[PDB]
């Protein structure tokens, strides 16, 4: 009904397909007229990805950006883990003499991984490397199930 819910990432030369539920989105096309995006090849920041599944998702999630940005390259894109909910924002900044001031722009959401299959998108016979377990009796007791 206009709210996006699934974001499927498929690194399709025989690679992994992760799938993400996509909970609370905010679209700049229906809030803010402030101009264009910055569209510089960005920097990336990631908050407490320590599990092996976390290293896998940060690998397949940061290997889709432009490789090797510069120092001046402005916009930073964050992926913060708050209990198995990768929250995504992206900002631009400048360096003040006091410090740094950020500017929120572009989308914001949070995505929860729920399948990560080794085959490509089309097959459905793909061997599951990881999917979450909604109905074990210890579902809400740990992270990266």
């Amino acid at each position: 009904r206009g709210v996006p819910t699934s974001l499927t990432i498929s690194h399709f030369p025989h690679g992994p397909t992760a799938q993400f539920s996509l909970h609370n989105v905010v679209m700049r096309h229906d809030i803010i007229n402030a101009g264009n995006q910055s569209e510089v090849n960005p920097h990336l920041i990631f908050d407490n990805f320590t599990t092996a599944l976390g290293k896998r998702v940060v690998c397949i999630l940061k290997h889709l950006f432009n490789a090797g940005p510069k120092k001046d390259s402005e916009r930073v894109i964050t992926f913060a883990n708050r209990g198995d909910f990768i929250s995504v924002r992206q900002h631009v900044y400048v360096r003040t003499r006091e410090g740094v001031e950020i500017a929120e722009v572009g989308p914001r959401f949070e995505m929860r991984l729920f399948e990560l299959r080794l085959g490509t998108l089309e097959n459905k016979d793909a061997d599951v490397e990881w999917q979450l377990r909604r109905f074990i009796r210890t579902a809400n007791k740990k992270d990266y199930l």
Binding site: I45, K62, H63, G68, V76
Partner: peptide, 13 residues
Amino acid sequence: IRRRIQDSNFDDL
């Protein structure tokens, strides 16, 4: 994120 970029510890490629 502002403490992170005050460290400038962004983990890109």
